[PDB]
Structure 1
Amino acid sequence: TIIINVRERIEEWKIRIAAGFIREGKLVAFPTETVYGLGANALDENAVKRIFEAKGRPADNPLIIHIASFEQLEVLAKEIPEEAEMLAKRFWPGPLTLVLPKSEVVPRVITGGLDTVAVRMPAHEIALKLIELSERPIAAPSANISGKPSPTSAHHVAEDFYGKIECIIDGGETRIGVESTVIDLTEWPPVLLRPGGLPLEEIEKVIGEIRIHPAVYGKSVDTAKAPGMKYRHYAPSAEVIVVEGPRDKVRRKIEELIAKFKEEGKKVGVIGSGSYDADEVFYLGDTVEEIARNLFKALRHMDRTGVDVILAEGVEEKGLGLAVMNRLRKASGYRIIKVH
């Protein structure tokens, strides 16, 4: 494992070392604006298998192909609707992933055996450079062991994968902190498959209201066209309890619960915006933008400690909050206490 630290002035020879790894069929973990990704060359069927092996990822849970040029979209997908071309122009580079029908060129291991492919153009210099210099499209899910919280720093990637993968590009902590929004363009209206770093209200204001996949609300699925729909995700070792409702009524139940669980002989962690004394505490922030940026960090911090149970302070679904609440709920296994 070579760990390459690149700072905002990108020493291109550094990226080239990782480029080489990609062309050679090896694994390279890289930052995006969203979360750290675990890359292989998307055109190399065998390289992509290593992604699945390394993570312990079920073969039918697809990967998202990352691109740096609009030209490459035409290469990876067939029958692209003009409305997908339009969203692409408008939101790329950025935290939006489009599901489209796939071309012959795309190996089925990438798509989890399907005719659809998921594509995105990341808003991160490093990731773009890595793809440009790599001269390959890069298949990548989140750079974490399957089931576990997503990585928002090279540290997180290293705690899961140092000595197991060829390369980690350290670009620091990711700016948004939650995964890209995934929308299915194989039907109209588009279907929200995974809420994410591009809020639903940005899409709807442009194209009107879209359909929400039941998966987003907890429906278990047999076939997934996108990541983050099938199997369990984002989850620390601990049990997680999400406490939803008005600020002060929530904070009071978290006090009740801290105590009730200590009385029970358990170490409690709390993640939220309020003050609390408990075995472990992580301050997520006051804005939802700050909370999304710290979510996974906080879940990893808790996961590196004794805590038997974590108590999370919910947020409203506005903006990034739909993504944050999607992640918290799935992590908890829909273990939800609605004060209200």
Structure 2
Amino acid sequence: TIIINVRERIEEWKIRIAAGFIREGKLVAFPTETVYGLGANALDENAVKRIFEAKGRPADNPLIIHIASFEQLEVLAKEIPEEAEMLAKRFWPGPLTLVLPKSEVVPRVITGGLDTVAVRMPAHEIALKLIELSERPIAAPSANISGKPSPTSAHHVAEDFYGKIECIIDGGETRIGVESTVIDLTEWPPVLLRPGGLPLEEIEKVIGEIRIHPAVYGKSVDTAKAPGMKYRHYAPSAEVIVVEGPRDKVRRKIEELIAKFKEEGKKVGVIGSGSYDADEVFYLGDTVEEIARNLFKALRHMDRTGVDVILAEGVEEKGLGLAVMNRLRKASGYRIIKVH
């Protein structure tokens, strides 16, 4: 593995090293505005397949293709809806992923064997410069072991993958903290498949109101058009209990369980903004924007220690809040103590 520190400023030749790797059919981890992605050349079955391997990822769970130019979209998808052009021209480059019907050049191995392809234009200097220089599209899911928390720093990528992959570009920590929003434009009205860095409300202002796939709220799915729907994800080794309801009643409830779970002789931490006494306590932030930014730091911080159980305070499902609650809820496999 080669780690390229590009935190301070970007230096062309550094990124060129990695571009070579991408071309050589090797794996390269890169920063994005959302999470680090584990990238391969998208036009190379072999390269791509290396990704599912490294991750332990079912060939079933599709990948997202990252582009840097609007013209490469027409290359990867056919019969592009009008809405897609409107969302792309308003929100790309940005934390938005569009599901479209697949052009023929895109390998079935990327899409998990569907005529539907997921595409994004990452809003990050490096992610874009990498794509340009490597003169190829990059298929790139979250750069973690399948099932575990998402990476939001090179440290996180490295503790999962140092040794086992050729390259990690270190860009510092990712600005937003959670994955891109996936919108399905292969149906009318469109469907939100994964809540993300781009709030629903913003998208609904542009194109019409959209529907929400029940996957978002924990319906198991036989077949997945996008990542983060089928299989477990975002989950530490530990157990996670998410508690939601009004401020005090949630805090109160958290306190009962700390003590309850301490009596059973279990080590316990909490994620939230409420100030309890336990082995571990990670403060997520005052604002949702801040919470989204720290969510995986926290989940990984807890996992590295030896807490056997984690208690997460819920948050409002508006804005980035829809994503955090989605992630937490899917981390615990839907253990949600609802308080009234």
TM-score range, shorter chain: over 0.9
Provide the rounded CA distance (Å) in 2 between the counterparts of 1:118 and 1:206.
20
Residue 274 (structure 1) shift: 1.1
Deviations 1:60-90 (A, max 9, x none): 1000000000010000001101211111001
Deviations 1:15-55 (A, max 9, x none): 00000000000000000000000000000010000000000
Deviations 1:145-195 (A, max 9, x none): 000000000000000000000000000110100000000001111100000
Provide the rounded CA distance (Å) in 2 between the counterparts of 1:126 and 1:157.
16
Provide the rounded CA distance (Å) in 2 between the counterparts of 1:165 and 1:53.
11
Residue 144 (structure 1) shift: 0.0
Deviations 1:226-275 (A, max 9, x none): 00000000000000000001111111111111000001100001000111
Question: How many residue pairs end up in the alignment?
Answer: 340
Provide the rounded CA distance (Å) in 1 between the counterparts of 2:138 and 2:127.
9
Query: Secondary structure of 1:86's match?
Result: helix
Provide the rounded CA distance (Å) in 2 between the counterparts of 1:98 and 1:4.
30
Residues 87 and 207, structure 2, Cα contact 8 Å, conserved in 1: no
Residue 9 (structure 1) shift: 2.2
Provide the rounded CA distance (Å) in 2 between the counterparts of 1:8 and 1:95.
23
Residues 182 and 226, structure 2, Cα contact 8 Å, conserved in 1: yes
Deviations 1:193-247 (A, max 9, x none): 0001100110112223211001001111111000000000000000000000111
Unmatched segments (≥5 aa) in structure 2: none
Provide the rounded CA distance (Å) in 2 between the counterparts of 1:15 and 1:144.
21
Provide the rounded CA distance (Å) in 1 between the counterparts of 2:166 and 2:225.
28
Residue 8 (structure 1) shift: 4.6
Query: Secondary structure of 2:43's match?
Result: coil
Provide the rounded CA distance (Å) in 2 between the counterparts of 1:92 and 1:8.
25
Residue 312 (structure 1) shift: 0.2
Residues 235 and 330, structure 2, Cα contact 8 Å, conserved in 1: yes
Query: Secondary structure of 2:276's match?
Result: coil
The question of 1:232 aligning with 2:232 is answered yes
Residues 268 and 310, structure 2, Cα contact 8 Å, conserved in 1: yes
State the identity as a percent.
100
Partner of residue 67, structure 1: 67
TM-score, reference length from structure 1: 0.99
TM-score, reference length from structure 2: 0.99
Unmatched segments (≥5 aa) in structure 1: none
Query: RMSD value over aligned CA atoms?
Result: 0.6
Deviations 1:94-129 (A, max 9, x none): 000000011110000000000000000000000000
Query: Secondary structure of 1:8's match?
Result: coil
